[PDB]
Amino acid sequence: RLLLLGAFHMFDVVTAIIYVAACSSYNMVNRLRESLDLFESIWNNRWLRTISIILFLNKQDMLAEKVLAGKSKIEDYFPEYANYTVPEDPKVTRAKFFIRDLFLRISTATGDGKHYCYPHFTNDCRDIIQRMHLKQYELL
Amino acid sequence: DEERALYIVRAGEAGAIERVLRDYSDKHRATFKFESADEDKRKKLCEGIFKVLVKEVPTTCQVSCLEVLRILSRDKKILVPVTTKENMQILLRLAKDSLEKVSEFPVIVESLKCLCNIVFNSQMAQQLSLELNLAAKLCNLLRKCKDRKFINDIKCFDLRLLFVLSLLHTDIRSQLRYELQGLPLLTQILESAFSIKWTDEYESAIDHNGPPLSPQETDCAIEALKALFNVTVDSWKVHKESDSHQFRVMAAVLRHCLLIVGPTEDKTEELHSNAVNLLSNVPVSCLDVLICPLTMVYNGMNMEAIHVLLNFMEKRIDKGSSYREGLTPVLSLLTECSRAHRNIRKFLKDQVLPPLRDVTNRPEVGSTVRNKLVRLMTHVDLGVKQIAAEFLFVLCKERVDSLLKYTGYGNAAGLLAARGLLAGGRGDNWYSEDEDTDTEEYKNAKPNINLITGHLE
């Protein structure tokens, strides 16, 4: 069975843990720090030293809108955002990568080789091709 | 600079202009950013040029004037006072109706280039294009070049102008597809570039020792493929029974295109990419001609084109830049082909997911094609991470139990959650009766297996 602790028999409260946390709560006051603390508490336990974790990061569009609006800035709540190595609008991909890395750095430290973490973010072809055709046109 | 040129143009001496304008074109040949201190003078020069093309002049003077005007027309601001119907009629008159004369080809080429620049840059020219009926004249010029020689440049730039007009306006696009016979004519152009000699109704004769193509034929083919993509954008919305014969010939021509090489290794990729882009608009029920021959060989069929497509995708994954614009069309085309046909799906399943024999390694680590497609399943982008999962999900007959064997629950959790099934289940489609395909070693190691990770501890 798999346990759902988000904030084949599926149950809501064992072989795997499904943990979901909204990624656009950094401005709200913060909640992202609480989520990271809970994740680091569950990952480093000793009773669960062989179970893997599947992580879901939803509400991406709300974060995109919030970062494009510009009313609230990340660095006001997460001072580590500055001096961050470079990897739509260029101010969204950096935010998404930073949010993912905050969770990833906790896992890599300990437990290597006994369990793993799987992070997931939760016609288009014609539009993609038309936009590519427009952008790449070169004047004679 | 422009003051002396304008004065000597207003003077009117035929010989002096052919030298002054040529020198001006030589000095400015690779400039694309203009400063605002030189605007007014430039504008005046532009008008002066249009004042001299009305009178009769030698051909070299016309060529020089058109070269200078092409350079000036790059900047958007100058065109506003000089976009009028009387001015455009002169360009149309120069471009066009007897092709017997041979020394007047460069004039036609230069006028077509100037029209391309003017139509793309400005906005009123697109509105005048409907009034002047440019598309019908372009198609007539295309038909007039059926058998003549020394015609490649005119055809290439005619196709370029048609592509621009179709891209920037919708009324002209609707005029080409349903009236004016756009689909046959353009198809014929391709059939003339590749030199196809039909063996059967929808089959062509292919020689392995065939000579490579030429740069000019490559350029004509590329322009024709782009224009044909713009014409048939809304084809899949409504399909009748009287259009199948027209689309099957197009599919056969594209299949013949996929089996030849260009001059260099860089043009071949562009040719195949444009062919793959066009193939995504043809209705799915007319794509069987891709495996049309009955003689890689599977079930007594010929499957070289599918192998070429697979190699194309595998080589595109290797470089790690721009996955969104480089992997969506080919993966979508392969999934659509595999959903509706039976031979293609079985061939691809045997080529991508062979029977399992290595159990002491994780799916993500490795260098085979299965490993790359599994690594692609956890990506920040949504389109890539969904299409790469769906491609593997189709090959396994939409059964969860067969997907979890090859990939693992951890990698497939996202796709399972998206489709609403997180437990044992099946897809909506039913393909055929399940069989047994298990290797012996796996049968030994199954009791001690890890379902979440996908390998043996």
From Swiss-Prot, chain A:
Q: Which domain of life is it from?
A: Eukaryota
Q: What's the name of its gene?
A: GNAL
Q: Which organism is it from?
A: Homo sapiens
> What functional role does this protein have?
Guanine nucleotide-binding protein (G protein) involved as transducer in olfactory signal transduction controlled by G protein-coupled receptors (GPCRs). Contains the guanine nucleotide binding site and alternates between an active, GTP-bound state and an inactive, GDP-bound state. Signaling by an activated GPCR promotes GDP release and GTP binding. The alpha subunit has a low GTPase activity that converts bound GTP to GDP, thereby terminating the signal. Both GDP release and GTP hydrolysis are modulated by numerous regulatory proteins.
Family label: Belongs to the G-alpha family. G(s) subfamily.
Region G4 motif, as annotated, extends over: 54-61
Which positions are annotated as binding GTP?
A: N58, K59, D61
InterPro entries, A to Z: Gprotein_alpha_S, Gprotein_alpha_su, GproteinA_insert, P-loop_NTPase
Disease cited in the entry: Dystonia 25: A form of dystonia, a disorder defined by the presence of sustained involuntary muscle contraction, often leading to abnormal postures. DYT25 is an autosomal dominant neurologic disorder characterized by adult onset of focal dystonia, usually involving the neck. The dystonia most often progresses to involve other regions, particularly the face and laryngeal muscles, and less commonly the trunk and limbs.
Please give the subunit comment from the record.
Answer: G proteins are composed of 3 units; alpha, beta and gamma. The alpha chain contains the guanine nucleotide binding site. Interacts with GAS2L2. Interacts (GDP-bound form) with RIC8B (via C-terminus); promoting GNAL folding and association with the plasma membrane.
Compartments where found: Cell membrane
An example Pfam family from this entry, by short name, is G-alpha
Q: Which residues bind Mg(2+)?
A: D12
Report where it is expressed, by tissue. Answer: Detected in olfactory neuroepithelium, brain, testis, and to a lower extent in retina, lung alveoli, spleen. Trace amounts where seen in kidney, adrenal gland and liver. Found to be expressed in all the insulinomas examined.
Per its record, how is this protein called by name? Guanine nucleotide-binding protein G(olf) subunit alpha
> Which residues does the annotated region (G3 motif) include?
8-13
Curated annotation (Swiss-Prot), chain B:
Q: Modified residue Phosphothreonine is at which positions?
A: T437
Q: What is this protein called?
A: Chaperone Ric-8B
| Phylogenetic placement of the source organism | Eukaryota, Metazoa, Chordata, Craniata, Vertebrata
Q: Cross-referenced Pfam families, in alphabetical order?
A: Ric8
Result for mutant: R70E: Reduced ability to fold GNAL
**Purpose of the protein:** Chaperone that specifically binds and folds nascent G(s) G-alpha proteins (GNAS and GNAL) prior to G protein heterotrimer formation, promoting their association with the plasma membrane. Also acts as a guanine nucleotide exchange factor (GEF) for G(s) proteins by stimulating exchange of bound GDP for free GTP. Acts as an important component for odorant signal transduction by mediating GNAL (G(olf)-alpha) folding, thereby promoting-dependent cAMP accumulation in olfactory sensory neurons.
What the entry lists under InterPro entries is as follows: ARM-like, ARM-type_fold, Chaperone_Ric-8_A/B, Gua_nucleotide_exch_fac_Ric8
Question: What is known to happen upon mutating N117A?
Answer: Strongly reduced ability to fold GNAL
Entry keywords, A to Z: Chaperone, Cytoplasm, Guanine-nucleotide releasing factor, Phosphoprotein
Q: Which GO terms describe its cellular component?
A: cell cortex; centrosome; cytosol; plasma membrane
Q: What is the effect of changing A417W?
A: Does not affect ability to fold GNAL
Q: Which organism is it from?
A: Mus musculus (Mouse)
**Cell location:** Cytoplasm, Cell cortex
